[PDB]
Design a binder for these strands. Structure first.
Ligand SMILES: [Mg+2]
Length: 851
RNA sequence: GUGCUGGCCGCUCUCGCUAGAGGGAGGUCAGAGCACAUAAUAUCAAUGGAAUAU
DNA sequence: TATTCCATTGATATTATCATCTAGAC
DNA sequence: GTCTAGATGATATACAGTT
């Protein structure tokens, strides 16, 4: 009902409504706001003031003192009510009596089946079984186990229940009624049970969300403080002193600034540098200790200082939440409210008994929808259809497969434009077989034996590489117990390829022009930027820029006029591209990504151009625009990419992906480029789309999955001029391979290996511990260097990278030497040989295999 | 059902004019295939522009 | 190279998406 | 009967270069 079901949702537009629906909705929202605000004060939370960006705050003690005045003598009852409501679950399903005026308490506990079977089996149960059964139930725990034994022995179950039922009644079910009579709580409709139930559960949801957020926030602050306090060295003190000195000159620190300043301080300089204040401060005697520090220590000190600066920036408490926006109001079938669903020829009719009827329209998402009524649920059957708004289009209509789901609740919500929407959250049912093998077997370093015994004897698996160009590179294989082949699945057996590595979709013809357009936009931006500077000091623009600007036909020759001619020409081309791609439905995804990049650049060009007249000293801030067209196009592209991958892999069980990193902090130089791929949300969408078809997804370690040889495990050199080719040197021969089919193959190799074989590490964690225990004798070992950089593990080095190439560990230097050897060999234009990874003459894939 | 496109004409703004470029609302003429898990709250990091300094 | 102000975007955590007894009715 | 509405319901699946 909940363990093996997958929830999804979609909306229907409410065309019209009868009865007093709007009054009911408005009353619910107003009471939600009021009582959420009140119960936030009953639970004395600290919070930061919103008006001054959290400079000041209200301590928990002041909130506690104000609560003592607000509640008075009901102080203790409210605390118990709040504890029960915050814990949640079934023991708190009777809190709606805080609002309901006609609430009546039953004086006996419910005769549930779990207690029927307990009482009916008292005769045969020994004392140890009895005490172990009732040590977790708070109702049954009200009676000692020995008394249970005498009751079972001397009395019949029919009279046992009568003797016991009043004794084990839950005494926290009457707390709300105690508060309402004592504080005079009144809601808008105190004689409607469903109204009170819905209101209480919505308010409780909001308060529980804030409770969990608040506690994790207060925990994380202390965690950060302890982590800062555990790392204290001399370099940290020196870096703190250096950072303070720079802030007095309004300069501030950075990793590049510190590193390059230390680099440039040793060498005497003549020409002034971009980082000159830092260099001048670094040449002072009091920072001599920074100039002789080792790189690892300097990096660690910088990291600790960065953590300290982030820690000092946090507020004391989170903001008080804003309750003003509307909530989705849920109504169900066993008590929350009452609704009936009727699918008609042209409408969907939702019947709320005494709050009117809602008439809704049909979707193409819920195509050919039918609903069948069952005792406490609806069975939904529908399909997806193409929406073609053009009446006479040449596209042949398509229809998807059937979908069967279970519906038990509905939601109602109002959009800010004044339209009402009905949400239908349904649940799909699939076997939890594929999702448990992915989480318990393939994500574990050492799976337990009973997991291994339950695995099937055959599997189909896949792997894929995702990039900004040639978006997807997939590979499909089949593994099984008792099979033979090049692929070795750890703890499971062997397997052989089904569909070798390839590139699913190459880039389109229009990708070349969409880069020239962005180059032109950036060049115009530079022209504007230097025109302003030359205007300020009464100089003249350089001849190169004037020659470039004069290439477009213009009605004048002054620079401002030439820059405006260039901007008009550049947007005539962007609009043409947008129109042409929208005409076809955005067939190519790489072209769409390039178009998005060009549009983003053009927006900055316009923003710069609008401020082309400002005078020194005066600032101009950004102006708010209520535009959401870019966010709806960017989202459409991510969903379309997730669909291509899931459509390719529709017959697999497990799919392997590398866990990519999202945009980074200020120290990264290319995080504007990775915001455009935007990888983490793409992975989320891929997981959601695979999960709708009962396919498991695993994320494997990514370091070195683009540098090892899939066949022999040797390192290669990836060309800098062209990133789509990688070169290897084996058997005194030079070989070349595609660097996207190498990534997919290495991802498949690491997935089948549970990511235990490392690419590089420091002289541990579960993966490295298992690798050390299996490849070598034991996990408690030390390392000594030998020969020309090879390492021998013995049962010394500290803090050094060690790489695994070809089955042996090697030191950092030998890895550099091998890559350099390949580089010098290729620089001499030595002809290489093409190797295909889908060859059927390959006898073993040795990449990331330690056994 | 939700989402994503241009040309042309007035009006109205900001900037410039040896000269035009851009924004907003509206009218009109066209274009239009393939995706869809729906919400509330909180928190962190960056992107772009402008001014300032070595 | 750095600082400050605006508005917008990527990402990650919480809260959610009912079942079964009982008392009245008719 | 069988409805249909209100008050009450045992505990709990990993790991740490890449775009
Ligand atoms: Mg790649």
């Amino acid at each position: 009902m909940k363990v093996h079901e997958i929830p999804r949702s979609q909306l229907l537009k409410i065309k019209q409504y009868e009865g007093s629906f709007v009054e009911w909705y408005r009353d619910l929202q107003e009471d939600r706001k009021k009582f959420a605000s009140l119960l936030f004060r009953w639970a004395a939370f600290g919070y930061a003031a919103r008006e001054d960006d959290g400079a000041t705050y209200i301590s928990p003690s002041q909130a506690l003192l104000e609560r003592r005045l607000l509640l008075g003598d009901a102080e203790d009852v409210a605390i118990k009510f709040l504890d029960v409501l915050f814990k949640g679950g079934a023991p708190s399903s009777s809190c709606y009596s805080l609002f309901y005026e006609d609430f009546a308490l039953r004086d006996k506990a419910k005769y549930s089946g779990a207690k029927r079977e307990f009482i009916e089996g008292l005769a045969t149960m020994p004392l140890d079984k009895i005490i172990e059964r009732i040590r977790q139930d708070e109702q049954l725990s009200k009676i000692p186990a020995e008394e249970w034994l005498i009751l079972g022995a001397e009395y019949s179950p029919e009279e046992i229940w009568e003797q016991v039922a009043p004794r084990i009644v839950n005494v926290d079910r009457s707390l709300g009624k105690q508060l309402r009579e004592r504080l005079g709580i009144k809601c808008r409709r105190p004689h409607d049970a469903g109204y009170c139930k819905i209101l209480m559960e919505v308010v409780a949801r909001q308060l529980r969300s804030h409770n969990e957020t608040y506690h994790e926030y207060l925990n994380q602050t202390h965690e950060m403080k302890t982590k800062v306090a555990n790392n204290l060295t001399n370099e940290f003190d020196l870096v703190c002193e250096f950072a303070e000195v720079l802030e007095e000159k309004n300069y501030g620190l950075g990793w590049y600034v510190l590193w390059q300043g230390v680099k440039q301080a040793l060498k005497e300089q003549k020409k002034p540098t971009k980082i000159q204040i830092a260099v001048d401060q670094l040449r002072q005697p009091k920072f001599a200790g920074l100039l002789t520090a080792k790189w690892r220590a300097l990096k660690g000190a910088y990291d600790t200082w960065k953590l300290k600066k982030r820690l000092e920036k946090r507020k004391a408490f989170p903001y008080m939440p804003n309750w003003d926006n509307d909530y989705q109001i849920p109504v169900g079938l066993t008590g929350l409210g009452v609704f009936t669903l009727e699918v008609k020829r042209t409408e969907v009719v939702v019947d709320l008994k005494e709050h009117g009827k809602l008439f809704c329209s049909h979707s193409h998402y819920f195509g050919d929808l039918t609903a069948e009524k069952h005792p406490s649920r609806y069975h939904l059957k529908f399909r997806h259809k193409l929406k073609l708004r053009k009446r006479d289009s040449r596209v042949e209509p398509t229809i998807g497969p059937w979908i069967e789901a279970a519906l038990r609740e509905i939601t109602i919500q109002k959009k800010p434009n004044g339209v009402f929407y009905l949400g239908l959250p349904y649940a799909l049912s699939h076997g939890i077989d594929n999702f448990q093998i992915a989480k318990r077997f393939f994500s574990a370093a050492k799976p337990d034996k009973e997991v291994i015994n339950g695995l099937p004897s055959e599997m189909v698996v896949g792997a894929a590489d995702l990039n900004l160009s040639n978006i997807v590179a997939p590979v499909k294989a089949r593994i099984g117990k008792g099979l033979e082949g090049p692929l070795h699945a750890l703890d499971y057996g062997y397997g052989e390829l089904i569909d070798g590595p390839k590139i699913l979709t190459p880039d389109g013809p229009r990708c070349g022009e969409l880069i020239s357009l962005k180059r032109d936009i950036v060049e115009i931006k530079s022209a504007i930027k230097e025109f302003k500077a030359c205007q300020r000091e009464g100089l003249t623009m350089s001849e190169e820029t004037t020659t470039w600007l004069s290439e477009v036909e213009s009605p004048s020759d002054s620079p401002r006029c030439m820059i405006q001619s260039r901007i008009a020409d550049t947007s005539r081309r962007l609009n043409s591209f947008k129109y042409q791609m929208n005409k076809e439905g955005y067939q190519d995804l790489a072209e769409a990504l390039r178009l998005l990049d060009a549009m983003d650049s053009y927006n900055s060009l316009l923003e710069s151009y609008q401020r082309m007249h400002l005078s020194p000293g005066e600032q101009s801030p950004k102006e708010a625009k209520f535009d959401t067209k870019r966010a709806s196009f960017r989202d459409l592209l991510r969903r379309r990419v997730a669909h291509t991958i899931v459509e390719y892999f529709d017959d697999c069980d497990i799919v392997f992906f590398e866990d990519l990193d999202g945009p980074s902090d200020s120290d990264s130089r290319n995080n504007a480029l990775v915001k455009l791929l935007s990888p983490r949300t793409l992975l989320l969408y891929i997981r959601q789309a695979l999960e709708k078809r009962g396919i498991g997804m695993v994320e494997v370690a990514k370091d070195g999955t683009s540098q090892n040889n899939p066949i022999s495990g040797h390192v290669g050199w990836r060309n800098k001029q062209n990133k789509s080719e990688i070169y290897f040197y084996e058997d005194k021969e030079l070989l070349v391979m595609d660097a996207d089919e190498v990534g997919a193959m290495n991802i498949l190799c690491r997935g089948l290996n549970h990511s235990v074989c490392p690419y590089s590490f420091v002289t541990y964690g579960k993966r490295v511990k298992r690798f050390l225990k299996d490849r070598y004798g034991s996990s408690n070992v030390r390392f000594l260097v030998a020969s020309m950089g090879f390492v021998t593990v013995t049962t010394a080095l500290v803090g050094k990278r060690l790489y695994y190439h070809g089955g042996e560990l090697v030191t950092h230097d030998l890895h550099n030497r091998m890559k350099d050897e390949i580089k010098y060999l290729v620089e001499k234009e030595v002809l290489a040989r093409r190797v295909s990874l889908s060859d059927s003459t390959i006898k073993s894939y040795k990449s990331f295999a330690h056994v």
